[PDB]
Amino acid sequence: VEVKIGITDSPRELVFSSAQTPSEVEELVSNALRDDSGLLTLTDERGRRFLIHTARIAYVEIGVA
């Protein structure tokens, strides 16, 4: 899956290739944004870690499986 993260007050998206399923990523993002844990972590297919300050997320776009 291509995953794209829009960051508030920035025109540049975080984009990476995920090895997880769309439902897995959706659940991660949804749960992070609703239980206010402050930090959302998403890891790409090579093991790069993206640690995102949840309050600065504008949107997450999740591609097709």
Among 19, 21, 24, 50, the residue binding a second copy under the rule CB under 8 A is 50
Block residue for tokens 């007050």: 9
Do residues 7 and 57 make contact, with C-beta atoms less than 8 angstroms apart?
yes
Q: How many CA atoms within 13 Å lie on the side-chain side of 56?
A: 12
**Binds a second copy (CB under 8 A): choice among 19, 21, 24, 41:** 41
Closest approach of a second copy to the CB of residue 33, in Å: 5
Terminal C-alpha separation, the chain: 6
Binding site for a second copy (CB under 8 A): 1-2, 4-17, 22, 26, 29-30, 33-34, 37-39, 41, 46-53, 56-65
